[PDB]
Design a protein around this ligand. Structure first.
Ligand SMILES: Cc1cc2nc3c(=O)[nH]c(=O)nc-3n(C[C@H](O)[C@H](O)[C@H](O)COP(=O)(O)OP(=O)(O)OC[C@H]3O[C@@H](n4cnc5c(N)ncnc54)[C@H](O)[C@@H]3O)c2cc1C
Ligand SMILES: Cc1cc2nc3c(=O)[nH]c(=O)nc-3n(C[C@H](O)[C@H](O)[C@H](O)COP(=O)(O)OP(=O)(O)OC[C@H]3O[C@@H](n4cnc5c(N)ncnc54)[C@H](O)[C@@H]3O)c2cc1C
Ligand SMILES: NC(=O)CC[C@H](N)C(=O)O
Ligand SMILES: NC(=O)CC[C@H](N)C(=O)O
Lengths: 611, 611
């Protein structure tokens, strides 16, 4: 059942569409809105899974493993809009550490060699000079520090151009700093380092050892690439939600109501009734028996919270756009082209127990963070069965305290216990590595462990299994990476390739947009962003794909915030938060987390902890 | 001035549109046809340049250098349609060797190491085991032979599945041979070698050392990739035209008439007048003062000789297509998607003299063929000022004769003389290397040698100069590749990036389609090809992009030949040739070339030559 006419139509039930709805309901009384979503699920590029494995330990019990098919981490600083969102939805009590290292034990596979992070530090970083035919100025330093030093040189040469480095910083950085008279957004990073005199060997080392080579090889420009590279310092304290990033959209859905959200309802095109001055949205819904329907309705205001690919599709097919003048239609198409599509993927393999601990490898145990490799892997992130004690031990560790032997010893048993509970690995890769897995996942039968109901009762709806080819090659690279003969067969598998599709012969449950976007070369994104708020009268665009903060949910909320500003008069949520609370969302979130971490620690770790 | 109405409208003045016109005029009396071309030049992806440098040797004389901005080589076997075309246009007297090696002196740059082909043979191919962390089964053999052996294994395991290996062979190969129960066109080559057990090191070696990595990393499927890899054996005797591949389209234009060809006339869209049963083609022409015009005309039969990208553009914007039923419109869009777009580029740098001969390097001289590298270069091909004696010496060399010292000694002076005349290098790269040059060519001022009229009188219309950034980095890689401190500044430069564009803010003289295409994964190209001959009634498609022989002009002529068959009753030109001549075009072209080579040799090389 679909309304006649709504005050605002919301196209897209990702984070951008949901956020708009909740803010207009709550902050603007607007209750005559509805959300139209083409998939059978809400939340878009945020997609968590919770598997209740059958406890089949010697001892009808269930053990839950959280995992991510999309978004996974966030930060307390630089995401004020997202922090305020958390604080206002009362979700901060679920916030849990996302750790990024294992004390140097994380894995590294390059040029047919498997080793650890601590290994790579040996001997003035000798191994890198041995695997890569580096220039003298490029030897004897840690790879990541090369990107670091280059950043510092860029800043030294642009004095014309700050403790917390947020989207303002990153927009001005790429739009105002230059190199050899050319500003950074007219540069590719690949051309940048080369022009700076780095060897091609060094440059391949950089994009292989950073796991995500699109920053170098894609058409994305150097300035936005840097924004991404300097988002993962050594001392990052990422956090996540215990039950997954889907906590946030689900929490938004409860507070919107499933009755204003219309699933399996793709908005096909939009015209504008010149008479009663209302947009007219042609759509296609599948009902619950699976029998299609094609309708149409009006709306005074239209909100498209859609990425680059979806927006071109509507633009092509909509009378509201075609009947625009040649110059403005072509100008507006042209500025759609100014953000580059970044494919991403994540393939999760669950195991009844974890085999990368010292008990199973005979090598120093791997715990948390990315295991990088120049194999199609890109990077590999371990995920563990949910467990309160473990998060407390992780919370103790975010504090760089000095445990006394009693507490150190208990942290040991905790660090080792997790290997006995179920767990999973994610292969998270980008640009260059995608095609390898593409062809793999679409060829041959799909993988299923035998007796797949004897462990795992419900299997979530959003889980498409990895192809048997994908598991096969993933199992061989894992042996390579973790330097062990022993990698068993997954209990469960999921594959998800965030790469937009233009083929009609693809089911809905397999159609997914481009995982991330990043500003293209030559793209003045100050003009692009502002021209895409209200490009037609009362028709708005918002979302991550053309934000200040590409690749992150904060990007979606800031881009939506401009829509809620220009079309509805709401100021930025972070500014709203401060006025109502007398302090920032950054400050409020830290104080709140400190208390829960403080508790969790005295409860499980050191009952005598003092901050 | 543009006709009311023609019997056949030809959209595209590349090789496919020109060939259709000439065959319908000549073989079918149809003279009420006209060609509509969006650019200011005929010929499409065939684009030769001829520069008359000012002879400024000590001694108003001009020295001409042929070069290629697109297509450059062909073969006497497997291109029967193209050979018959040559023989019927009387162009065989201009056919000249295109050599592919320099006796082992060609260059190789990999992992920061410059060396020669003869070097790589040393010591059971030792250098490859030293640059690449190869598996034991992958050491001690020449890289190219790995692709060779893998081919032979594929054939061994498919006995169900031939002296001259033409398009029939290659279609059946990829559509009927399988590996692990999956036919080759359901495979990527990357996944294929991996599943066969090759190391990732080995696989990076293969796609770097073959210069054109799209065969591995693009979405093209394994079978078509092989067709391309086994098109360059060791013993290839490529030939070209002395004045360039543009000889062929120009020769077609003379025999069509510039009066039936309409340049700067883009066909914008096509509808179908249901009344007088005629297609109706909306267009846009620029006149000779540069003032636009938008007209329209009819045609009984429409011939689109256009690649994948151009065909989608019309499909989107044409009432003849939109008003098709949902299922057939979406089916036909879907099968447009079944050939993968392969970007290509070629950047030519001309020099008053050649600096890679032993006189300028102190190293064994480089002569002909690809100098490969894992640098963004991809490959580098030397081009020399035209010179009759040189082609005779090259013709002597296609015969693997054994010169007596007199003749050997004269071939020496000839081999060395060319370094003193002007010459040029082409950087010919693909897939992964494109973006590097992209950003380079679009940033900063464009390169011009000072006093650029004091040598080079006319500069051809199709020459866009390389950006000053492109020359800068090209000059540094050349020093790397040719292992010399000394690489001077080009006298003239051209850049041309065969990568389709969707931006309106691009001039016409910079809009170029995708350089080549290759069959995607999952694409049964027997069905795709035949469904795209006459997809609407009396509206036809032909060209390279969906041919049996992607990447070559023979592909365009065979795909057009199906259009001339189904819509007009003409049999294949090669079959036509045989009936009229009593023998093949392969046989006739070899006998003709043998005679001219036989002459040329006795004239310049060994006046006592016996075949
Ligand atoms: C692999 C991956 C990992 C990530 N990790 C992180 C992370 O750790 N931290 C972080 O902060 N961010 C992360 N992100 C980014 C985050 O997922 C996004 O920034 C954000 O979720 C996208 O918000 P959006 O609403 O702009 O887009 P989306 O979430 O993609 O919303 C678009 C929605 O519109 C729907 N839609 C499309 N067309 C139509 C139509 N015609 N009619 C109706 N509905 C339509 C789509 O189905 C989808 O539901 C990650 C992204 C990916 C791909
Ligand atoms: C770098 C490179 C090197 C190559 N080397 C070789 C080689 O050595 N040997 C070989 O055999 N082949 C080679 N080829 C392949 C060869 O160039 C092509 O196979 C062939 O020339 C293309 O023929 P076509 O007519 O199918 O396409 P095109 O030549 O591309 O013809 C398309 C034409 O249609 C025009 N057009 C497009 N849209 C419209 C419109 N709306 N209205 C009007 N006109 C329009 C375009 O401007 C163009 O003129 C090479 C190709 C490239 C890119
Ligand atoms: N490459 C990107 O922009 C992805 C960033 C994303 N937030 C992540 O966790 O990886
Ligand atoms: N990669 C391709 O298909 C290009 C082939 C083309 N005939 C050439 O000379 O390179």
């Amino acid at each position: 059942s679909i309304p006649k006419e709504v005050k605002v139509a919301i196209v897209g039930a990702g984070m951008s569409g949901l956020y708009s709805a909740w803010r207009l309901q709550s902050e603007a009384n607007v209750g005559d809105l509805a959300i139209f979503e083409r998939s059978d699920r809400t939340g878009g590029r945020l997609d968590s899974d919770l598997i209740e494995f059958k406890d089949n330990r010697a001892g009808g019990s269930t053990i839950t493993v959280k995992e991510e098919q999309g978004g996974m981490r966030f930060l307390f600083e630089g995401m004020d809009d997202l922090m305020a969102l958390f604080l206002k939805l009362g979700l901060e009590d679920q916030i849990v550490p996302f750790p990024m290292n294992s004390g140097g034990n994380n894995r590294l596979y390059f040029r047919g060699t498997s080793f650890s992070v601590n290994d790579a530090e040996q001997d003035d970083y000798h191994i890198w000079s041995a695997l890569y035919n580096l220039d003298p100025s490029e030897q004897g330093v840690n790879p990541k520090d090369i990107i670091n030093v280059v950043f510092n040189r860029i800043l030294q040469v642009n004095p014309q151009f700050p403790e917390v480095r947020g989207p303002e910083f990153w927009q001005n950085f790429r739009l105002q700093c230059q190199w050899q008279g050319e500003p950074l957004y007219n540069w590719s990073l690949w051309d940048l380092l080369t022009d700076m005199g780095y060897s091609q060997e060094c440059i391949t080392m950089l994009y292989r050892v950073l796991g995500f080579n699109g920053t170098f090889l894609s058409k994305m420009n150097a300035g936005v690439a840097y924004q991404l590279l300097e988002d993962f310092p050594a001392d990052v304290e990422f956090r996540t939600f215990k039950d997954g990033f889907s906590t946030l959209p689900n929490a938004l859905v409860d507070k919107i109501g499933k009755d204003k959200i219309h699933l399996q309802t793709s908005i096909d095109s939009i015209a504008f009734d010149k008479a009663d001055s209302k947009y007219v949205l042609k759509y296609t819904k599948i009902d619950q028996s699976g029998q299609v329907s094609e309708g149409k309705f009006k709306a005074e205001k239209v909100i498209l919270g859609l990425p680059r690919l979806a927006l071109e599709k509507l633009f092509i097919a909509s009378d509201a756009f075609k009947q625009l003048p040649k110059k403005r239609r072509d100008e507006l198409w042209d500025t759609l082209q100014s953000t580059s599509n970044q494919p991403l993927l994540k393939i999760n393999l669950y195991y009844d127990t974890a085999w990368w601990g010292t008990g199973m490898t005979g090598r120093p145990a791997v715990s948390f963070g990315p295991n990088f490799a120049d194999l199609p892997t890109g990077s590999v992130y371990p995920f563990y069965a949910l467990n309160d004690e473990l998060a407390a031990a992780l919370m103790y560790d975010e504090r760089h305290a000095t445990p006394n032997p009693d507490t150190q010893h208990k942290l040991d048993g905790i660090d080792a216990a997790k290997y006995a509970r179920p767990a999973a690995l994610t292969i998270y890769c980008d640009y260059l590595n995608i095609n390898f897995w593409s062809a793999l996942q679409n060829k041959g039968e799909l993988y299923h462990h035998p007796h797949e109901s004897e462990l795992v009762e419900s299997i979530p709806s959003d889980i498409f299994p990895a192809s048997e080819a994908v598991v096969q090659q993933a199992t061989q690279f894992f042996k390579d990476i973790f330097n062990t003969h022993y990698v068993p067969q997954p209990t469960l598998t999921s594959a998800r390739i965030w790469e937009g599709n233009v083929n009609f012969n693809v089911p809905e449950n397999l159609q997914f947009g481009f995982g991330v976007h990043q500003w293209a070369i030559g793209a003045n994104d100050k003009e692009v962003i502002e021209d895409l708020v209200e490009p037609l009268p009362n028709l708005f665009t918002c979302g991550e794909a053309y934000s200040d903060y590409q690749g992150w949910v904060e990007g979606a909320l800031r881009s939506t915030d401009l829509v809620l500003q220009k079309g509805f008069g709401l100021a930025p949520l972070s500014e709203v938060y401060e006025q109502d609370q007398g302090r920032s969302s950054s400050e409020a979130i830290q104080i709140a987390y400190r208390k829960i971490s403080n508790k969790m620690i005295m409860e499980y770790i050191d009952p005598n902890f003092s901050p």
